[PDB]
Amino acid sequence: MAFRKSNVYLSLVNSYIIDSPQPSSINYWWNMGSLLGLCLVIQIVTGIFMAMHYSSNIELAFSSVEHIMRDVHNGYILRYLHANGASFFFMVMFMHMAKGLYYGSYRSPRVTLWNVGVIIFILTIATAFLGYCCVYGQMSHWGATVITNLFSAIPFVGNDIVSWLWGGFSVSNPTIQRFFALHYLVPFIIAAMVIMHLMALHIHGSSNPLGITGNLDRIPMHSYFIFKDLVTVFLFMLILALFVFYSPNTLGHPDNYIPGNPLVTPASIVPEWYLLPFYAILRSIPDKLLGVITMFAAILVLLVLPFTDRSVVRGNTFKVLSKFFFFIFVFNFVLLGQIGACHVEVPYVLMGQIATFIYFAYFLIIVPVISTIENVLFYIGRVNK
Amino acid sequence: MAFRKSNVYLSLVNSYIIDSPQPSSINYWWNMGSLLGLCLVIQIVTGIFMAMHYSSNIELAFSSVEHIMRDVHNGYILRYLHANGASFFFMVMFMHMAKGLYYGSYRSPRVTLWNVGVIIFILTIATAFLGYCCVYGQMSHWGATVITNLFSAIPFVGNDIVSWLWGGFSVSNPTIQRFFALHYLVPFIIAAMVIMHLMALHIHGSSNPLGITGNLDRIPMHSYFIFKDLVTVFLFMLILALFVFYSPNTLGHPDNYIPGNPLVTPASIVPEWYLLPFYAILRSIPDKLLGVITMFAAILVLLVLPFTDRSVVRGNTFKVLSKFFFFIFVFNFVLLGQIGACHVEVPYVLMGQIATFIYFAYFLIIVPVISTIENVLFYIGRVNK
Amino acid sequence: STVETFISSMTATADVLAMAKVEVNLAAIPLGKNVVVKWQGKPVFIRHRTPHEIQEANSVDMSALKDPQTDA
Amino acid sequence: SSLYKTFFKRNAVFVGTIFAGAFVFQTVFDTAITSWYENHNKGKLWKDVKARIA
Amino acid sequence: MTAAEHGLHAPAYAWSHNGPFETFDHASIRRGYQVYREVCAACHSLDRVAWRTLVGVSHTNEEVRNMAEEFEYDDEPDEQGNPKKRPGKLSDYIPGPYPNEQAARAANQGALPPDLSLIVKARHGGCDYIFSLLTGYPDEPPAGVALPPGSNYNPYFPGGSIAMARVLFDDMVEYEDGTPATTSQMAKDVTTFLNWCAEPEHDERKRLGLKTVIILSSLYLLSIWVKKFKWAGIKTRKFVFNPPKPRK
Amino acid sequence: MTAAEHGLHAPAYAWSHNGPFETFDHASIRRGYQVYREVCAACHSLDRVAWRTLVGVSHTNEEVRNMAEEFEYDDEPDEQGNPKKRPGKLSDYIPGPYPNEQAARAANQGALPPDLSLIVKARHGGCDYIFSLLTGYPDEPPAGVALPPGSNYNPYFPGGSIAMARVLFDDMVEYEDGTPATTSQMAKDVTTFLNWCAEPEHDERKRLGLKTVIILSSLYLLSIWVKKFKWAGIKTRKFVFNPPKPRK
């Protein structure tokens, strides 16, 4: 046989990116996976070449970031690529998970793939939070303080857990040093989970935007989806180059260029832009413990998703009401982000509570009821009696 | 079928550490691989939990190491495990490569396995050197200086390569910071190369100490070699616990507790104990460029090994002269280490040159000639005419 | 261009090129004094010589030197 | 086009043509874009200010 | 919050360095440094701006050297361990007027004057906010506002009550080039200078952005062509189906 | 090198903390601190030893507090930014006698006295080397050695010529417990104290070593039993072979 098939190392390259049978009807929404892989490689390479100049002391963190942006040759390129690419990493990941919810890729036989995806999502949120605290600006310090006090809400144990996390009594030098070590560490766990994700994908192949089988008309990976992914790679690099070179500090928060001061609290403490729906979910609950439980349940309710989709056809392509309520859900998630960006004021508390309820009601009540009604409507539309 | 066979993730755990067919005659020398895996996990876990307290500035490196050994709870356990476990990592790796040379595991069909082993060996030497320079003692600073000036020996380009490595004009703050970043990075490349090593092993299975096939009497991995590896794991932890808790600073060099001073040169600059044969090979050549080329050729001459072993039986088990000259080679390697630990004095220069020549003559002249003579001797011993 | 960016980011930064040169004063160092400074991460010996030390320097025969070199 | 396949037939001369094209393109594109970016900002750069200061 | 705690919205002034192609006005940066040194530098540090960054940007080599040699920095001590001073050089940083935080809070009625190295990048609105802050003090606060004594009013500060004084008056500095130095002129000059101090890469960032956007747009259109090319065998593929003989 | 450049080999003194079970002599550490403070501390810093490490090791709580309050450290400045001092506390470090390196080289004829926090762990020989260094000065150097003026001889230093003076004489300090304070007694006490300063974990390190070696030896013997147990079906396995009927 061929050398790409008989060699031990090149057989994986073959069976994953050369001769992988892909369904020939998949559109550009089946390209966000390759795009996330490229953006992860961007994050790791800029992280290494920018962490060769970073000193993680609490008295030397912000000065070393400014040393990168001023004294290091092309260091502004590195930091701006790194932060804005983390923003694009979460945006492409949100689009990828929306592709997962829409076309029904979570359903059987792809439950393992969906669960490893949710694990990757949790690890990526953790990585972004740790790296945002490594800047040690104003928002970095106070966001670390608020999230660890949320961990202090745990009954009978929590204060000692938080003194363990801090490595002291408040967010201090051991906290920033261990956040830098963990933040260097967790992306390699993300890379291992990505390899496990690709294995759980490869044992059944991709889905298709129709929700029927794709075993009939398969076309290879090579040259077809290689050049289709190359198209979206160049578009992604174009938009990233715009938001790096022409308007770099748009997505960030301007308070992060104030150095970390434990005495001055800011006027409005807000995380970076993508953690705002989860921050709104947590802020909508009038309790600390129930708030933390609801914030983690807002990700575990993605795990309870394949067991509630009672639709007998895969994906929302050929269904009306499920497609409508899907876009209700997407614009609700955007409204959660925008509620979280605001203050704790009338009527944003009541709207945050209603928006959290519509989030959990979509994942727990709306999907099974609308899928059951859509099944019975498909049946009685064509069966006569 | 069973769940350990039908699941995607547990099938790898099955086919590697549960139902892997091992030859039933392999002795305890086929246990150094599991021992190296355990010692790599030790190095990584102690590296993370000790790099949560490490600040990599040149003015704050040695003080942070002493902060680990004094102020951090159980930090002396972490540093002593880490340094002495790196010493045991190279000792078990030397024993593993000697198992490879002795029993002929380099021969066909295992050339890919041997080449990935040599790549792992080079990456591990690089990791140990970078982490030894991260201490920034006296030996750390001056060893970094000598090795990078050896990189300045390269014609027409080398000075700019060294100004690129240093990040300046001598071993300074950017050098120590990038050595810490690279030293955090390269062990994950070692883990990836270890996974590739296990793949290239698994496509043909282990050898056996007889040099014949082992396809006839295979016994599984599980409970048999699991508990045999558990025996040597507990012995390895026992000896590591001795050299950590009762005599920790034996293997190290006492000059490394002097802080890094660029003005004072030491009386004798010596690397840590295992790089001494390679340092002796390089010091034996009266030229800088030929010295660096000979030092890298002393590892690439392990790659030229399967093409010179002209013995028709696998391994030195049933051959007299090859076994004798193998132990000549092993004690020559020890003599290289002991020559390198000494000064540049009469007669250690002449003995270093003779010992380097016997090293390269074993890998290039002694093995093919003795294997040819042993083949003809096996033939005419039993064939009558 | 990507390789240029990620490799030239590891070269000597701006502030370590700022301290590449020292500008020691000729009028401030006395005659019979030696000045030892840390410049460019290296020691530098500085001396104001007398003309008799110049005459001692340029009149030693080259065969008393394993690497002969004139004073200028 | 035409019958010339001494550029496209052999992959050695084809990738050598692509490399020589990029080698010219780096220099020409950089010089042209620096000239345009300084022509668009006439009067604002330090060259014009240093020429203005007597 | 009301509009008073949030502060009034700074409007859209048409700066000479907005837009994806316009660079800084380096003569305005030179005049902004002059207004900085003669007004702000009594009370604002500039701790992250080295002297060498002004060489070739707003001043020549000898101008920066003769401005840095007016200041005293800490030399390495002498042969008896006595601490000594030295005149500045190109590699040092611009020194603040205050030796520590407590001297600043003592000399400014408790309020700490923030370091202005990143102040146009650490406020929302940015350039427009700094300009409207400087030129926004009323002659008298609106009727019904009880200021705490020692504080001043301008609506652009969040809360209304600021602890700065109105420090831009008509012709308090003289310009080297003879530009009429009114309040708005000096405020525009220092806001351009602080934009330089926060973003010294701005010129090279925009020209490398021009190169990168041109090359990636060309690559994106070329890749659209090659995708439409190599998929042409699959887009135009056709299927006919005559149903087979049912006897088999 | 000759034996002169390498230095004479320090012999094997039988310390009270050698061996895998013996700990430090804490009364000897207390007396070693007294000899340190009254002899060495004029010229040797101890920069890495905090005051709190002596509490419960060689002194009580109030003794360390009343020894630390004799020294002055840098307080945070007052409400006018003036620098002020404060008496020491338990969280500070033991201060050196010299404010910087140049004062040390000025007061000691050019030679820099090394910091003694790790000096028994940064010399080959260790305890034996420090003890033989202190008690090794001859009354006069051997015949034919031209010492550079201002330097002293003892054979244990590498090169023979050391820039230290012989600073251990008979009964220059008085001990609190009434021990006869000869030169060798004081040298043994300071070498034990410097062993404590380099290795404060030494006591707990040896007892955790005892626990770990006992548990791992028991695990190693138990694992040998379980390996001989689960392989018993394979060691005793037997094979007989009657060769098959050749017609097939």
Ligand SMILES: CCCCCCCCCCC(=O)OC[C@H](COP(=O)(O)OC[C@H](O)COP(=O)(O)OC[C@@H](COC(=O)CC)OC(=O)CCC)OC(=O)CCCCCCCC
């Ligand atoms: C925000 C930062 C994200 C950074 C990620 C960068 C990549 C952005 C990805 C956006 C995306 O993937 O959307 C895909 C969406 C669905 O695609 P489809 O397969 O149903 O359409 C087949 C096409 O006609 C085939 O036509 P063809 O394949 O020959 O060319 C496609 C097109 C390439 O454009 C794109 O990839 C998306 C812009 O080439 C062009 O002609 C462009 C002309 C300038 O494309 C569409 O057709 C648009 C439908 C509405 C989507 C709106 C998205 C709002 C979120």
Ligand code: HEC
């Ligand atoms: C060293 C390896 C490294 C890796 C790998 C890495 N980063 Fe980072 N990251 C850093 C460093 C260093 C910083 C702080 C310096 C900075 O912010 O510019 C940082 C900062 C960040 C920030 C804050 C940026 C800012 O300035 O506000 C975000 C967000 C972030 N990382 C996200 C990610 C994500 C998402 C990934 C991958 C999934 C990732 N990082 C991988 C090194 C790394």
Ligand code: HEC
């Ligand atoms: C953070 C992850 C990390 C990993 C992974 C790691 N180390 Fe280290 N290592 C360190 C740190 C931090 C130091 C410096 C602190 C110290 O020496 O105690 C160090 C120091 C060392 C030293 C010098 C020890 C001394 O004190 O002299 C050696 C030798 C070494 N590492 C070898 C290795 C080897 C071999 C591996 C794996 C194959 C490895 N390290 C993996 C963090 C790591």
Ligand code: HEC
């Ligand atoms: C929470 C959901 C989820 C997350 C987050 C997620 N994935 Fe996926 N991924 C999927 C699903 C589901 C599929 C298959 C969907 C289908 O084919 O219908 C998939 C498919 C893929 C594919 C195959 C191509 C494709 O688009 O189907 C790649 C490659 C991939 N993922 C990589 C990644 C990478 C890299 C990350 C981030 C590190 C990631 N994924 C994060 C759920 C997820």
Ligand code: HEC
């Ligand atoms: C360059 C030589 C070499 C190096 C270095 C090397 N290996 Fe191996 N390894 C081998 C060879 C050869 C074999 C096959 C043994 C044989 O001949 O049957 C092997 C086999 C193994 C095995 C299977 C168990 C065994 O004993 O054979 C493991 C596990 C293994 N290697 C792990 C490692 C790990 C882990 C490292 C370092 C991280 C490593 N090896 C480094 C050559 C090497």
Ligand code: HEC
């Ligand atoms: C009278 C002393 C004084 C002078 C002179 C002075 N400042 Fe201020 N400035 C202050 C003080 C005090 C603050 C702090 C205001 C506060 O914290 O409420 C301040 C704050 C600022 C702020 C931040 C305001 C905010 O709300 O964040 C800016 C911007 C500023 N000054 C610009 C300037 C500029 C430009 C100059 C030079 C023209 C200047 N200042 C000169 C005292 C002064």
Ligand code: HEC
């Ligand atoms: C006269 C001033 C002086 C006094 C008093 C003094 N020292 Fe020293 N000591 C030095 C100098 C100078 C050196 C280093 C000299 C050299 O390097 O040649 C030194 C070096 C040492 C060294 C290491 C020498 C080496 O070669 O590594 C030790 C150990 C030492 N002193 C211990 C002590 C002890 C213990 C005391 C108090 C009991 C003490 N010293 C008191 C001046 C002094």
Ligand SMILES: COc1c(O)c(C)c(C/C=C(\C)CC/C=C(\C)CC/C=C(/C)CC/C=C(\C)CC/C=C(\C)CCC=C(C)C)c(O)c1OC
């Ligand atoms: C030929 O027969 C075989 C055989 O086939 C096999 C497979 C093996 C087995 C081989 C191995 C076990 C080697 C495997 C080694 C690896 C896979 C390397 C992986 C190493 C790692 C350390 C994985 C990385 C994991 C981490 C870095 C996680 C650590 C994270 C921490 C500690 C986070 C801490 C932070 C907090 C907040 C808790 C044999 O031993 C063997 O001979 C009998």
Ligand SMILES: COc1c(O)c(C)c(C/C=C(\C)CC/C=C(\C)CC/C=C(\C)CC/C=C(\C)CC/C=C(/C)CCC=C(C)C)c(O)c1OC
């Ligand atoms: C479903 O079909 C598939 C499919 O099967 C696959 C695999 C992919 C591809 C997906 C990926 C490749 C994502 C996987 C991503 C990873 C495994 C991340 C790997 C990245 C790293 C391990 C980090 C990179 C590390 C380096 C490059 C090391 C070198 C770095 C440095 C800094 C060394 C420099 C130092 C010096 C001294 C020069 C698809 O896109 C795809 O859809 C078409």
Ligand SMILES: CCCCCCCCCCCCCCC(=O)O[C@H](COC(=O)CCCCCCCCCCCC)COP(=O)(O)O
């Ligand atoms: C690990 C990182 C994952 C990133 C996801 C990237 C997904 C797309 C990868 C594109 C690879 C293109 C190879 C095609 C190929 O070799 O076809 C080869 C030849 O094709 C070409 O020469 C393509 C021209 C050169 C394109 C170079 C693109 C480099 C920019 C890559 C930017 C992203 C890294 C085989 O083509 P053929 O079988 O039709 O004959």
Ligand SMILES: CCCCCCCCCCCCCCCCCC(=O)O[C@H](COC(=O)CCCCCC)COP(=O)(O)OCCN
């Ligand atoms: C991040 C990776 C995580 C783990 C996933 C594993 C997938 C790895 C993908 C690597 C793809 C590129 C590898 C190409 C190597 C192919 C060359 C080859 O196989 O030739 C091999 C020899 O390989 C070597 O000597 C060096 C291999 C080192 C590879 C280090 C990268 C030829 O050997 P052959 O297959 O013909 O067997 C005949 C037996 N005598």
Ligand SMILES: CCCCCCCCCCCCCCCCCC(=O)O[C@H](COC(=O)CCCCCC)COP(=O)(O)OCCN
């Ligand atoms: C570069 C490679 C790095 C190493 C990766 C390869 C080695 C991975 C070894 C992993 C061993 C531990 C995995 C055992 C978990 C088995 C559970 C399982 O497979 O059930 C999966 C579901 O798994 C999940 O939901 C999340 C698993 C994430 C794993 C996170 C570690 C169900 O699988 P299945 O479809 O066969 O079940 C049908 C029901 N009868």
Ligand SMILES: CCCCCCCCCCCCCC(=O)O[C@H](COC(=O)CCCCCCCCCCC)COP(=O)(O)O
């Ligand atoms: C994560 C990999 C770490 C492997 C360490 C192996 C090196 C041997 C030295 C260990 C000394 C550090 C522990 C210690 O100081 O304990 C000391 C006791 O000694 C021991 O029990 C060590 C026995 C090791 C058994 C290994 C079991 C395998 C566990 C795998 C991980 C879940 C201190 O005990 P104590 O703090 O008083 O409770």
